[PDB]
Amino acid sequence: IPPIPPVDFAKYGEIEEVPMTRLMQIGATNLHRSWLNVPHVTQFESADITELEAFRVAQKAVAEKAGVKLTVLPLLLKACAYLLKELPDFNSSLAPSGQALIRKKYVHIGFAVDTPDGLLVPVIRNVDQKSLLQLAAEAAELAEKARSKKLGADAMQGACFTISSLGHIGGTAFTPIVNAPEVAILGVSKASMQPVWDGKAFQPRLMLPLSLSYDCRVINGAAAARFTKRLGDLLADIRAILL
Amino acid sequence: IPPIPPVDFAKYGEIEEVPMTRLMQIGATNLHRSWLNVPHVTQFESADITELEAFRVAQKAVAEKAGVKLTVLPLLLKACAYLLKELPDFNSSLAPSGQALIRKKYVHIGFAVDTPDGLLVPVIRNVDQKSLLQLAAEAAELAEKARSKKLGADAMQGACFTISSLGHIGGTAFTPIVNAPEVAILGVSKASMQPVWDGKAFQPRLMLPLSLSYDCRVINGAAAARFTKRLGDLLADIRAILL
Amino acid sequence: IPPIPPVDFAKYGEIEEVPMTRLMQIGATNLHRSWLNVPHVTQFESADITELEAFRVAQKAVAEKAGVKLTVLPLLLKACAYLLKELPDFNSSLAPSGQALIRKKYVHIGFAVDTPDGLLVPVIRNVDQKSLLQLAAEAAELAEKARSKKLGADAMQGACFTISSLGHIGGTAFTPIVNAPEVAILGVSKASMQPVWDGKAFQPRLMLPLSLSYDCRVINGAAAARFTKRLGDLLADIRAILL
């Protein structure tokens, strides 16, 4: 790849050199390797979470009696796990021969935690078998160990899919980079009240912006629109997971 | 490009290998070749199609007496063909010498059809000379032959522009990949009723999300904002094509 | 990178070869070099500029008595300059060793001007020290010299950040390419009246679409959501710059 020409930045004013943590450099290398290896498309969608939000907030009591804080992430994890089982091409990697897909029969999902030293993505194993408060506890633990440098490399491995949630900071949508060898990543942004047509008038519904980046060698455009559509459907009524 | 490190996926659970159809592998190679060769920008816009939709629906009679189903795609094709003639840089390819553009004086447009074996993009020739019901019949035929493996390689060649419509499945917008050597591709997503300011109050207008990816070596940001703006203008009143 | 197979475009109809200006070829090379070197993510946001717009329009008198036209660009420049100082990682470049960031202690910002011969990005030096009408005059001058080929290469150098505004043509959002060695670029699209929930009803507020592309080796997803969030905050009340 043609390199970027060096510039003497000090010709234009005062500069200062700060160094990169090894964690940032590892991260830098991994993203650029994904970038050049995966042809990326982002599919955007927004889900109606008015009812999900009401549930979240009502179970604040239960969650606190169990010591966890029920946020939107355990709900996101549960729903993507159900869906990764319904649409198995999202739960696979491209074989090194380029001629086969390795479909995984397990569902472990990573989630982005941004710490001082860099971004870490802890992995929760067998998300499909854990409950909303179990996933809530685990997420919280892994996030804390990630911030406190106590996260052993074991827990950063063998994920099938990544969720990256920035809803707690802001933004309308973003285009995340697929953490290869996984084949998709779900970006989640800030929810806001939007007017939604009820067939007769605009009702305010709470809308969650979803941004699915995927590896289009493996997942074609229609399979991906169907994944964010099913996800939007499941988050609008999470009871559909029960059937 | 640095390769992706191989992972033993079976350390984390049960895996299964399914293979790729040759069609998927061809597709995979073409997309990655486009990805590394074309610096991509997506320009998003949404067009007001309330009136277009009313027309579509009124001519259901005519369309059925002629045996075709008038969908939004013949209308999209007709309008982009008019525009590919008004803005000829969108109807060209970059010469192999990198120092010239080959401007095409013809308008053939491909459209994405997603079949079981992979994605196919049949090409309708001289879209600029065919009528709405002609284009409707042709699209329908090519889509059927594409699904039934009866599409001869002849019909996959020499397109000037691609339309990729996922509006029938869902989504708010996506970032399509330019099928090089073409220089742009129009992604179309699901139409929904949106509140639009009439200078005094919000009126519900039916809005179609447009996502124009382009090769920014050939098309600069302003030329592309002007293309989706003219397209939004033409779809809001398709009679402008008549003049 | 695998090359794109040559096609005989004249098999499908009449073609014509127009050549590229050296300016376009320079531009083409720079964008493709950025594309392959920088892993890109776009963060989207929209800012409430109802009040900013009212101010702009009230100071039409002052602006005209000073000979400049106060547009949204001097306001964008002032606010990003304040922010490039608050969040210094946005005002830096990656060292050639890949292991350090060169943080710049100066703020010069470039802005995209699209001319007949290609795109130029003049640089305004020390934007942080100039006032709204100063920046207004300077922008206008540089834009004119850029269109009239009288822009000396000196003024295209040593920028820290780029603003690319297409709001005057149209569009909902786009994904700009980072002009490496800079680490971010702000795309600005067309403002429109949107319904925004006041906690009780939807109020029409004038909304400006912001599209921040960044180099995710240097800037992680959360730092970027926080930059467009602070920017949206500053444009909703530009008096916050005063404190």
From Swiss-Prot, chains A, B, C:
Region (Catalytic): 1-243
Active site: 216
Family the UniProt entry places it in: Belongs to the 2-oxoacid dehydrogenase family.
Subunit structure: Forms a 24-polypeptide structural core with octahedral symmetry.
Protein's job: The pyruvate dehydrogenase complex catalyzes the overall conversion of pyruvate to acetyl-CoA and CO(2). It contains multiple copies of three enzymatic components: pyruvate dehydrogenase (E1), dihydrolipoamide acetyltransferase (E2) and lipoamide dehydrogenase (E3).
Protein name: Dihydrolipoyllysine-residue acetyltransferase component of pyruvate dehydrogenase complex
Entire-sequence positions represented here: 396 to 638 of 638
